[PDB]
Every structure is written in structure tokens, then in C-alpha cells.
Amino acid sequence: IPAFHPGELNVYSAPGDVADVSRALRLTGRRVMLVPTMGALHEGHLALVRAAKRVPGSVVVVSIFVNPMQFGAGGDLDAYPRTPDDDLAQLRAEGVEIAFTPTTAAMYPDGLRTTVQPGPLAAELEGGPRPTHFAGVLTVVLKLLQIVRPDRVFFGEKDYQQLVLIRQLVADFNLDVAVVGVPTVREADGLAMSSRNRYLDPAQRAAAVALSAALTAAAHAATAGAQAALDAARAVLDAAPGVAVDYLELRDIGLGPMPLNGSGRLLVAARLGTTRLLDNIAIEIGTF
Amino acid sequence: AIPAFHPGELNVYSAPGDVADVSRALRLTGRRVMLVPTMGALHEGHLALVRAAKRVPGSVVVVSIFVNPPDDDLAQLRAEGVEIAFTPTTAAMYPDGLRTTVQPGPLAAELEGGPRPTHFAGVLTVVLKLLQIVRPDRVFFGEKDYQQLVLIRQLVADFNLDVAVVGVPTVREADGLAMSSRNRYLDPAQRAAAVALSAALTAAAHAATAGAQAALDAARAVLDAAPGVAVDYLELRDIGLGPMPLNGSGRLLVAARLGTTRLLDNIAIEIG
Numbered sequence A: 001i002p003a004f005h006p007g008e009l010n011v012y013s014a015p016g017d018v019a020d021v022s023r024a025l026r027l028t029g030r031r032v033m034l035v036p037t038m039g040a041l042h043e044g045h046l047a048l049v050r051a052a053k054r055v056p057g058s059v060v061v062v063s064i065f066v067n068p069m070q071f072g073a074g075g076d077l078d079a080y081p082r083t084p085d086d087d088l089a090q091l092r093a094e095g096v097e098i099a100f101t102p103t104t105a106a107m108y109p110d111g112l113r114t115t116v117q118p119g120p121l122a123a124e125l126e127g128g129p130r131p132t133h134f135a136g137v138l139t140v141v142l143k144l145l146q147i148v149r150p151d152r153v154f155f156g157e158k159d160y161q162q163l164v165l166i167r168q169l170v171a172d173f174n175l176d177v178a179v180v181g182v183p184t185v186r187e188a189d190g191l192a193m194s195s196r197n198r199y200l201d202p203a204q205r206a207a208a209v210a211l212s213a214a215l216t217a218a219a220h221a222a223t224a225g226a227q228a229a230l231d232a233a234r235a236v237l238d239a240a241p242g243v244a245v246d247y248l249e250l251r252d253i254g255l256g257p258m259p260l261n262g263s264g265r266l267l268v269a270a271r272l273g274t275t276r277l278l279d280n281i282a283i284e285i286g287t288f
Numbered sequence B: 001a002i003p004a005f006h007p008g009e010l011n012v013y014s015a016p017g018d019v020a021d022v023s024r025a026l027r028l029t030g031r032r033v034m035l036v037p038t039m040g041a042l043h044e045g046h047l048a049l050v051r052a053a054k055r056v057p058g059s060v061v062v063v064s065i066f067v068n069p070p071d072d073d074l075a076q077l078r079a080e081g082v083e084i085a086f087t088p089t090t091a092a093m094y095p096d097g098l099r100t101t102v103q104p105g106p107l108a109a110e111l112e113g114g115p116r117p118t119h120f121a122g123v124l125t126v127v128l129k130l131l132q133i134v135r136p137d138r139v140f141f142g143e144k145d146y147q148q149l150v151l152i153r154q155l156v157a158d159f160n161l162d163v164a165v166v167g168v169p170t171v172r173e174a175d176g177l178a179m180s181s182r183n184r185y186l187d188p189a190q191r192a193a194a195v196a197l198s199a200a201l202t203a204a205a206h207a208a209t210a211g212a213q214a215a216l217d218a219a220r221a222v223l224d225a226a227p228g229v230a231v232d233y234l235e236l237r238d239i240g241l242g243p244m245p246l247n248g249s250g251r252l253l254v255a256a257r258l259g260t261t262r263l264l265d266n267i268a269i270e271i272g
Ligand SMILES: O=C(O)c1cc2ccccc2o1
Pocket: A036, A037, A038, A039, A137, A140, A141
């Protein structure tokens, strides 16, 4: 155990340090909450922190680590926004008590050796053109879960496929953690919070409202059935200047090998210039 | 509510949740939870793992019995003073089928991974799951399956698992044959010839004062003196199964087929 000053932000880089402090805290009866992040924190991340904070007796651990294993070449890894000064300041302001900021060397001292192989869901949607992306995500999350051993781990719904795959990891490896999905935080016009929003110029920012407009239109059209919901979303996206749709799919809530019934999830990914944006929404078919 | 647990008796659980709940409750009372994973059909090798686990002060011993895709086994464990047997069904372990799995590093494609390219992914997946269900302080494996032991140490290091891996020296028959459930399948000619695996390895370990090549040559000579022993490999590696260093500690591993029965053995080697 290194030092832990309660009511203050404690930053640990060494996996051993945060593991020691976490273990000590849990033994004195605190419930450890984990919010895994890649930094560049926005209000979406702060909603996760606040949800964690609400759990009685909680101590909140926010990890910040840009994980090289979930990026493919070139390219993307070097381009990910890094603003540690802002991040830690936001955490102090939220009364978070632990930030965990490991090095690449500490996380991957043996490179990529044992890794997590996701189920078939990882090959679809976001995984289609990026066949190793979710192996990278699940490997890092497993490691963070083992280092920190939290009672609960918090993820946004914005990256819905990621959230589902993390629930699969937790179930499939019998991890003793509760996965908490938090509803997507949105700008006033509906745009989903994302660290990628900073790459939209004023015009693209304006056009980008079409993703959330298309989704909310579909959710309401859905009383009239799946075809109507999908066609409403498509119509809104088609009305949008220089939104280039990658996919728009209505799936079961688990995204998996089961047909859509009364409850589903509508997912969209689209490019605005070079910026790729995701959003999704709960859909009830035939329900007003 | 924590499931029933009677100290000093064999408590048998089939539900992962029950053993998970009991192990957590026990660990909170100042017991150190020891895990001995097995595939049942227990022999003296497995009992050596149990005995090693038992001698840890404050230990409660969990033996899992699961065939990765009985009453005799439980009596043996009872006779050893083991307090928890974990006997899950396949459906209990894989309620959602094979979905998320462990992908081993490149060592898994070598040696035993030649004939069985996906064997170790299966093993590491089930071992990770048992570690997560039981959350033992220490987990015990025989050295006989050395490559498996090394891959488990890589699993533990790579995924930041909070468990100590304990390798237990191989239990042997009187003539040196490494214990294995497969031994019973050997006819008398085969069982007599099978002694060449251990004899080759012990000869190598002693020849090793004269260097790496002398050790390998001594082992090959011994295997060459046996009939009906088809050697699949004979390899000297470092202790982590990387390339052998020019001097220092290593491990010599052999695998051979006698009729339809594949046998394995390995030994510590000190070079020079
Ligand atoms: O900042 C994020 O959106 C984020 C961070 C993070 C860390 C591990 C796994 C998934 C993750 O998503």
C-alpha cells in the first residue's frame, strides 16, 4: 500500500499501487467503482463518474489509458486526443479519489501474448473492417478489472456494441463485477457526446444532428413497425448534407443470434468528412 | 445467504455460484483458499497436488472435477480431508456456449500444440473461469504437463491475475514412469519400453555437466534403445520454454507414441 489521501485525487501509475490501494479500501468496507476511459474526458464520462459516485460507500477509480491494442495501423493511435491536464482537473472537480494512469510498458511488458478472443459479435458492425479492434478492448478491460477488482464497472451506452461485448466477457469468464450501462449524454440538439465531436467543423457539426434526429424519429415511427422505423431514419439521414452512412441496423438488444421481437436497438455509424460518428437508441416495435 | 458448508467434511457443489459464494465467505473467515483443478479419475499425481495444497497454513482445499469438452474420486478426496469439491456440468460452465475465449500466445502452437493446435486455448479458458469462480490464493498444477504449466503462468502474468501458481514435481512409478491415467492402456511390452522416457531424461540431466549437446545425445541414445517408441519431439528449452541459453537452467521435454498411447515427460536441466 502506497499513500491514499481521502477527499482528494490520488494518481497512481503502477498497476501494483492501485491494486494495493483498491484491496485495502475494499477490506475496510468501501465499494470500489471503476470507470475505464481513454482520457479526453467529456460530460459523457462525467455522467459515468456521477453514477459511480451515487453508489453508497463507493470509492471511484477512473482509469485513463489509450490502449494501443484496440487501434490498427497507422495512424489512429497517434491521432487519439490526449489532454491529461484537463482530464485530472475534471476528476478533481468531480471529487473522484483515484485516477489510474498506467504506462504502455506496465500494461504490455510482454507485448501481445495472451489475449481475449471475443465471440462472433466482434466481427460485425464496428468489427467488420476492424477485425482485431474488440479483442484489444476486451483484453484491456479484463486486465483493468483484474488490477482494480471493482464491485461495479461503468460504461456509456453510446458505444453500445462495446458494452454488449463487455457483458459477454463478464458472463463468459465468470467475472465477479456488475456491468452498469449509463444512458448516452447528449448536446442540446441531440448529438451524442464523443471525443470525436471536436473534429467536426461548424458545417459538419450542423449536419451531425441528423444521426440523433434519425434515431429519435425511428423510435417514434416504430408504433407502425420495423420497416417504418428504419425508413424514417433513412429518410432523415438522406436529407442530411454530407452525412455518409456506413451502416444503419436494427438488432435485438443483445445484438446477437436472435431475431428482433418487441425490443431492439437501432444503431448507426456515419462519416462526416473524415470523422466517423456512432449513435444508437432503444426501439420498441408496436409500442406508443 | 451463503450455501451450507460443513467444516472438516467433503462439501460438494455443482453450481458455480455456490462455490463462488462459499469460497468468498470462507476467505473472509481467515481461510486461504487453494484450488486444485482436475479432470477427475484421480491418481496419486492429483493427491500430491492435494497434499501440497493442504500443507498451507489456514488452507481450505477446493478440488474441481470437470471434463473440458466419480464416487471413487469423491471418496479419495474425502480420505484426503479435502473440504470442497466443485463438480459443474458443461452447461453450468458454458451456459452461453463457446463465446468469449482465451487466445494463448505463440507458445501454444509449439510442442504439444503441433498435434493439437487449439488444445491450450481450451485449457486456459477453463482455468481462467475456475480462477474467477473460486478466486483461490494459490492454484496447483503438476509439472508433468510442463508446457501447460508455463502457459498458465503466462495467463496469470498477462491478465494481471491475483493468484500464485504452484507447480508440483511429477509423481512417478517405482521405475520412474511419470504418472498418468494413460499408463493403464499400455500392454506389457509397451509398459516396459515406456521407462525409456524417464530414463532418457534423467540420463540427460546427469550428462549435462558435459554440455547441452551431451545431454541431448544421451537422451536420444536411451530412446533409441527402446522398441516401439515413436518420438514426436525431444527438445531442450529455457525454463519459460524459450530458446535454450548457452549455459544455465533449462528444461528438456519429450513426447512419444507407444501404439495408440501418447506419453509426455520433462525434467529440469542445468547446463554445465
Ligand atoms: O473513453 C472511452 O470511451 C473508453 C475508455 C475505455 C477503456 C477501456 C475499454 C473501453 C473504453 O472506452
